[PDB]
Design a protein around this nucleic acid. Structure first.
Length: 123
RNA sequence: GGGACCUGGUCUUUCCAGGUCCC
């Protein structure tokens, strides 16, 4: 039926079992909240890496259906941040990590603004 | 051989390819 061999895939293909998205030609003046904001209307986002020093970015969806729908819309449209359109496709990686730049400190902090409860009972 | 400038590719922060200018 509508089913297929979705058990494998890569960044140059679609239907990947991985929950990771990649963005190319990423703008410079753009921030961690923008890379999250383009993936939010597509489902829950639970990880993020800003690849500053390069025009690239990475994010992780909490669900495979959120990642599947995101690129399935972005496979026919190009997202834009601060008014600047840039390319997107699946990531070749699996689960978000950071191992090569201090820029990991800003990406792991921006996710807290998009996931905290911010309720008035806090102190 | 070196430097500067522009565009494209890109899979973890870069790297790579092409064009232009100067020594």
């Amino acid at each position: 039926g509508n089913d297929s061999k979705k058990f494998k895939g890569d960044s140059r293909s679609a239907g990947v079992p991985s929950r990771v998205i990649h963005i190319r030609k990423l703008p410079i003046d753009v921030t961690e909240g923008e890379v999250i904001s383009l993936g939010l209307p597509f489902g829950k986002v639970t990880n993020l890496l800003m690849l500053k020093g390069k025009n690239q970015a990475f994010i992780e969806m909490n669900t495979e259906e959120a990642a599947n729908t995101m690129v399935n819309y972005y496979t026919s449209v190009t997202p834009v941040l601060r008014g600047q359109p840039i390319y997107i496709q699946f990531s070749n990686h699996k689960e978000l990590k950071t191992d090569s730049s201090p820029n990991q400190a800003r990406a792991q902090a921006a996710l807290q603004a998009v996931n905290s409860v911010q309720s008035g009972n806090l102190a």
